[PDB]
């Protein structure tokens, strides 16, 4: 029951709801002053530019960004890079922070209790298909090929599923499907992740990407908001409820994935822990990145900040600066040091005689003279002092900064401010 | 201690901070779903477009909007009509809602406790002169003539004062000055407002417009934030502390007021109660408004929403529609009815045989056939039913809707929904 | 060749080219200082906002505006209302005026000689389907349903045809089709318009809307640009050449027309003479307009100018102002006069005791006291003096102003400045 | 007449007119497809971003850009980087190309015959002080210190003069002043530039920056447009006319220059010939640039294009890429080559084994494998083939490309297309 012009009308009758929401507690000290969607990525992006540029390029120009925890950077970023819309053309990016009225009320008890507080505003949009996007994730998806796959099957809810290794399948929503892609068994974040049939080493996992018949969502949240034992969550409460009525279908992600190399596998990185954040950025620095960002058929929109060109200058001794598989964004000033496998964001000043290897330097970092950096993540505005050594003595990096179990170091201003180093340059 | 070009450099060394903040509890039900700065005004404005367009036309392009209570409409309005800035030219409108973490903290204890939570962000602006604007007020001021008076007097704090009648001086900050415009005695919201010398019928009142030496403000809040018995307010705690050191000067508003008729008195309306809101809008509908809005030397910037022309059509009987001293904004459709002394905002539909007199019809109102309206304020999206009569029986309007002591009626959806009228259009 | 998602990919592979181009000599004095696409219409629109908002809502966000004659107002209008695009998202409105060098060259010899001068720029867009839009016309078309019909018939060129009366078929490119919508006989602006089969009173006319295979267009212009006897026009030279090879199909306009009343006929006004301009605007003033402009599923984008509400005030004698089936846009100030069947654009000042009937008052017009206006078009910024009478003596309106054969008067500043009246208010 | 607030009101009463105008014939082939104001500079700027960002930061937000020769790139640049204005706040960038009506009229005969053709539009702005800016020049000037010095002296015209070497003074307007900065003798482009008193090696030259009383300008052009012996130029016709009446004063540029190092001399480069274009860009690459572009108190606004970070990758052999005193803007991809004293603009692709020394690589250049480049300017989109050698054999670089007398090479697509190299990558 699909018309030949159906692929262009369904995005125009649809509304996306990005659950920027809370944080990732697994990113110890990267998030303490920001939400996980506002974590920097890619030299110039934040994570929420991925869950927003896929709505645009999918025709969905009606988004709803639900923000609760440390949203000042997020909201300022939406204001400055996602406020080119005109509300007359049926397009907007509405911010829906919890409405504060009394002393301390209305704080969004859950993921599914944030779309129910704002259920008097979303009704006004008059949307038939509600995409429910987790916007703390990194991907390149076309939701006008998932909306169709939702409309062909005659479904009421449509969960985007993609297989992942059973080792990491205890952190996502594992399901089980049939020949018609109907969800039979759904369980959220199990302790013993069930495997797929014919693939014992992999589990069919939910990505946090639900498409909903709007008439069904509203009747499902109002029918769940009165539940006293509910935890108010899509995975932990609702999707089991839809599944047990047999109204929940599964949409494979490889179908609706935008990738420039069809021979490759789909790219999904959720930046769960610190190690996967670091590994995810340097993938862009390699020679053949898994994530294409020089792609013009699916571009990513962000805050086009005005920065001068990246300047490389001679050190105090007149010598050269060497580079190898690195990204140097605008504003940077690298005074003749060695930079390898690194990602430097905007306005990173790197003075002389430094050595930087497999590092990620978030913006406005100042590296002092004669510093050695190996396998680290330097947070925003960190003023590294002269002669600092990082990533060569694991026993001396665990008791100064934070050091993951896999060997990744994280540097913040508070970590440096606690050792006496002044961070007011 | 002045200079030739000083009048142009100080707005650029300056930063404004709009305390959009809380509400006006004296605006009974007009605010229950919005902040007082987001109350509509003038057919197309909100109140915070006055405290923001005086920063632009005074050269202050660095503003800081502090929003706590019901800011969804406010933040959406700033997003859509005040997001044309480019952060590279040293200009921005930063939104500073209270940072929420752990799900119940940081709720801004006071007016002066909202500039102390955000005192790590405002330092980054590197501003010498901090203008502190109450943005729930209506005026036309030039803060590049108040900054000079502050920079021409050697002041540390400079309170904009204007005289008001002693009857209404119990709701503002009454002060007392000397021959050099030095504040001698300041008391906040007295029960017996002291009169001026030589003018027993009027009191010298603070408008809520403080200009501050930045070096003094940061040292004054951090010296006040540690106080456990303080109420955390500019008027109630800080301005007496500055006054008692003799570092607080007074800047008369008639000097820095922008008015097209120099023979007139300065215009200040803080839309305190309901009655002054109604009286303030209809002042624009009279023949000679006290507030000039057809002024091109000091224009007011707002959300230029795309609306069709105001349409006047014949009623069901083919008859004419009469108008008398009224404002009809864009989108409106008036089907042959009588409109007098009224202000119709955007998208107001007025069906046949209506009679509307001294009314204010906030946006998206639908008036049904054969309605009579007198001395009323119809709130957003109210769907008035057919044959409703308002403003002719005071005993029958007080038990349906809200009716002030002076005779002004207010109509909301909740008031109409409670009488059985369906508000689903 | 009709794939599930073909309806959404073809607009992105497409590029529109608006031939704003020359003028309408049949608009005697309305155009003398502007291009016909920049003629005002609708109270707030210009004609080129129709050929541009149909590209946006059809997904075609890459437009090319070819401007030659008096484009100052046009270019300024595109600059201020059509410059919200970001070139990184594959979207833009490129202005392509003739490139002037040596002070006397490159002046666009024809309609199809304007897309050949800019053919070193349009190749860079890398477009497969080139829509060729005449943008001096008024309609509501969906070019993502003409593009489908173009890709599902296997066509190389596809001319949008609609039947019109044989009495107005001498100014269009009349064709003749077959059962498969293949153009058999095309002749451009005949003296005896051939009729349709079974409809002797109507002719199947070209609207000026060609969709082209881009690989065919470039090879057709370069194969025509070398022709010495060609007139360099799409109708007079190219479309006959395509037709005579049998590669030209016809797309009926009723299929790809957006109208809110399916029972109605498609709306197409070329605003040819003066009489159809006047008649076209007042259709919006009637009770049931043929053109829906309160439509939210196909809105029209324009210069959203910041204007105050429409003010109606009492005249010198304290009397009422009456209105009947009229449009009053923003900025207007009507001092107690009678306005009937009229359309007032922005900033129209109408002083006391006026009588205005079936008029169109283009922007910034000042009507003086005691003026009577009937069946007229008042041009931009015309300062009508006190006691002027228009539309009651045809013999006295033909020797002052311009008066069409049908009774429509046109008033310009030059017509009024020639009678001695000062036009410098 | 030095009023307290005069420094802030005069920019708002003022209007700037950038004579983007014609070309520099002295830039042999750099300009053949663009105007000299649209020549690229600085890695991301064009020259007219200098004559435009000084109006913004000087408070002048009403600009008028007069464009005649090859303005497609210029106009597109203003459209995309200088169209953030709102005409309601009294601010705009009006483009004023010559009006074409019949078939080859209205071709700006001179510099001063372009402000006379557009004299019906500039009267509408209602400006008292008309700044006349040559926008083919590079500087950092504050015109709110030049407008004041014009108003203190009680002048009618105020020519910004700065001393330059007598060797290059035959290309500017040499004048002679008195103790009160009154112009005594003005002569335009002499063959023997007269020297200054006490500085025989230097001449007091006009920069092309005239401030005018508007009531005098309109009366001077209309009194000059009717002259049959006039050449219609500010220098060659008008400024002698003002000087011979004694109404022309001189404003030294060092007063109103914005420079971060007060010990330095003012920076003025007219980018005359090819050699001063190359030398002007590489000045930004040195360690201490003469032009500060990391200045936040006087930033330069431009088309903030969305480009990915600058990527450095390993060559085919796995080796390092070295850099020394170079600028690499965004989009670039340098595959392990040596870059010295260079300036790479956006989207410059540099394949392996290249050697680049004192080069300027304008955008979208592709350098092939094993290329050596020395003292060259590679124009837009040049696709350099594999193994090309430039700047090592002057006799072999003069008969291929263009080579100045000083040794600077210029490479264009037409120069490469004529040697057989395909330039369609
Ligand atoms: N230059 C800076 N110095 C110190 N903190 C900053 C700076 N810029 C931003 N921040 C803060 O760093 C935190 C993270 O911001 P961001 O890295 O932009 O998400 C927020 O608390 C910001 O206010
Ligand atoms: N058309 C409408 N119908 C019902 N409520 C509305 C409508 N438009 C806005 N609102 C709500 O009215 C309240 C006040 O919004 P505002 O009048 O824009 O300050 C908010 O809760 C809005 O979400
Ligand atoms: N207020 C005005 N008074 C006189 N001429 C105007 C005014 N506004 C625009 N024009 C001119 O009227 C012509 C048509 O402009 P437009 O009506 O905008 O297409 C152009 O030559 C404009 O410069
Ligand atoms: N990628 C490209 N390939 C060939 N020509 C181009 C390219 N980009 C711009 N041009 C042309 O180069 C000339 C100069 O443009 P610009 O360098 O932008 O001033 C104009 O004719 C442009 O249309």
mmCIF file of N, CA, C and O in Angstrom, chain A residues 82-105:
data_model
loop_
_atom_site.group_PDB
_atom_site.id
_atom_site.type_symbol
_atom_site.label_atom_id
_atom_site.label_comp_id
_atom_site.label_asym_id
_atom_site.label_seq_id
_atom_site.Cartn_x
_atom_site.Cartn_y
_atom_site.Cartn_z
ATOM 1 N N UNK A 82 22.389 26.003 14.249
ATOM 2 C CA UNK A 82 21.166 25.326 13.879
ATOM 3 C C UNK A 82 19.970 26.246 14.049
ATOM 4 O O UNK A 82 18.893 25.822 14.484
ATOM 5 N N UNK A 83 20.157 27.516 13.709
ATOM 6 C CA UNK A 83 19.126 28.546 13.817
ATOM 7 C C UNK A 83 19.079 29.377 12.544
ATOM 8 O O UNK A 83 18.898 30.600 12.567
ATOM 9 N N UNK A 84 19.189 28.679 11.409
ATOM 10 C CA UNK A 84 19.050 29.253 10.077
ATOM 11 C C UNK A 84 17.680 28.994 9.481
ATOM 12 O O UNK A 84 17.477 29.267 8.299
ATOM 13 N N UNK A 85 16.750 28.458 10.266
ATOM 14 C CA UNK A 85 15.446 28.053 9.785
ATOM 15 C C UNK A 85 14.480 29.230 9.770
ATOM 16 O O UNK A 85 14.664 30.218 10.476
ATOM 17 N N UNK A 86 13.412 29.078 8.989
ATOM 18 C CA UNK A 86 12.291 30.004 8.958
ATOM 19 C C UNK A 86 11.042 29.205 9.280
ATOM 20 O O UNK A 86 10.707 28.269 8.547
ATOM 21 N N UNK A 87 10.359 29.563 10.378
ATOM 22 C CA UNK A 87 9.223 28.784 10.851
ATOM 23 C C UNK A 87 8.056 28.791 9.878
ATOM 24 O O UNK A 87 7.148 27.964 10.034
ATOM 25 N N UNK A 88 8.045 29.693 8.885
ATOM 26 C CA UNK A 88 6.943 29.724 7.928
ATOM 27 C C UNK A 88 7.008 28.584 6.921
ATOM 28 O O UNK A 88 5.969 28.186 6.390
ATOM 29 N N UNK A 89 8.217 28.094 6.605
ATOM 30 C CA UNK A 89 8.402 26.978 5.679
ATOM 31 C C UNK A 89 8.246 25.609 6.335
ATOM 32 O O UNK A 89 8.706 24.607 5.770
ATOM 33 N N UNK A 90 7.630 25.533 7.509
ATOM 34 C CA UNK A 90 7.417 24.286 8.237
ATOM 35 C C UNK A 90 8.750 23.608 8.554
ATOM 36 O O UNK A 90 9.058 22.496 8.100
ATOM 37 N N UNK A 91 9.558 24.322 9.328
ATOM 38 C CA UNK A 91 10.873 23.843 9.706
ATOM 39 C C UNK A 91 11.350 24.619 10.924
ATOM 40 O O UNK A 91 11.113 25.828 11.038
ATOM 41 N N UNK A 92 12.012 23.914 11.830
ATOM 42 C CA UNK A 92 12.406 24.472 13.107
ATOM 43 C C UNK A 92 13.192 23.435 13.886
ATOM 44 O O UNK A 92 13.094 22.234 13.646
ATOM 45 N N UNK A 93 13.939 23.929 14.856
ATOM 46 C CA UNK A 93 14.651 23.107 15.834
ATOM 47 C C UNK A 93 14.224 23.621 17.203
ATOM 48 O O UNK A 93 14.839 24.533 17.760
ATOM 49 N N UNK A 94 13.146 23.062 17.728
ATOM 50 C CA UNK A 94 12.623 23.473 19.024
ATOM 51 C C UNK A 94 13.393 22.834 20.173
ATOM 52 O O UNK A 94 13.570 21.607 20.210
ATOM 53 N N UNK A 95 13.797 23.661 21.135
ATOM 54 C CA UNK A 95 14.465 23.207 22.340
ATOM 55 C C UNK A 95 13.390 23.023 23.390
ATOM 56 O O UNK A 95 12.531 23.892 23.539
ATOM 57 N N UNK A 96 13.405 21.879 24.072
ATOM 58 C CA UNK A 96 12.363 21.516 25.026
ATOM 59 C C UNK A 96 12.946 21.184 26.395
ATOM 60 O O UNK A 96 12.772 20.077 26.895
ATOM 61 N N UNK A 97 13.673 22.101 27.027
ATOM 62 C CA UNK A 97 14.129 21.824 28.395
ATOM 63 C C UNK A 97 12.954 21.748 29.343
ATOM 64 O O UNK A 97 11.905 22.331 29.088
ATOM 65 N N UNK A 98 13.134 21.000 30.423
ATOM 66 C CA UNK A 98 12.070 20.831 31.405
ATOM 67 C C UNK A 98 11.637 22.196 31.917
ATOM 68 O O UNK A 98 12.474 23.013 32.307
ATOM 69 N N UNK A 99 10.332 22.425 31.957
ATOM 70 C CA UNK A 99 9.800 23.732 32.361
ATOM 71 C C UNK A 99 9.859 23.861 33.870
ATOM 72 O O UNK A 99 9.240 23.065 34.578
ATOM 73 N N UNK A 100 10.586 24.854 34.375
ATOM 74 C CA UNK A 100 10.757 24.987 35.817
ATOM 75 C C UNK A 100 9.780 26.051 36.285
ATOM 76 O O UNK A 100 9.844 27.198 35.830
ATOM 77 N N UNK A 101 8.908 25.681 37.230
ATOM 78 C CA UNK A 101 7.851 26.558 37.713
ATOM 79 C C UNK A 101 7.944 26.766 39.208
ATOM 80 O O UNK A 101 8.079 27.901 39.673
ATOM 81 N N UNK A 102 7.885 25.679 39.963
ATOM 82 C CA UNK A 102 7.906 25.755 41.409
ATOM 83 C C UNK A 102 9.355 25.624 41.856
ATOM 84 O O UNK A 102 10.287 25.737 41.064
ATOM 85 N N UNK A 103 9.542 25.529 43.169
ATOM 86 C CA UNK A 103 10.867 25.511 43.793
ATOM 87 C C UNK A 103 11.857 24.587 43.108
ATOM 88 O O UNK A 103 12.958 25.003 42.726
ATOM 89 N N UNK A 104 11.442 23.330 42.909
ATOM 90 C CA UNK A 104 12.248 22.299 42.283
ATOM 91 C C UNK A 104 11.523 21.234 41.478
ATOM 92 O O UNK A 104 11.939 20.079 41.569
ATOM 93 N N UNK A 105 10.496 21.560 40.688
ATOM 94 C CA UNK A 105 9.684 20.531 40.050
ATOM 95 C C UNK A 105 10.130 20.240 38.611
ATOM 96 O O UNK A 105 11.091 20.814 38.093
#
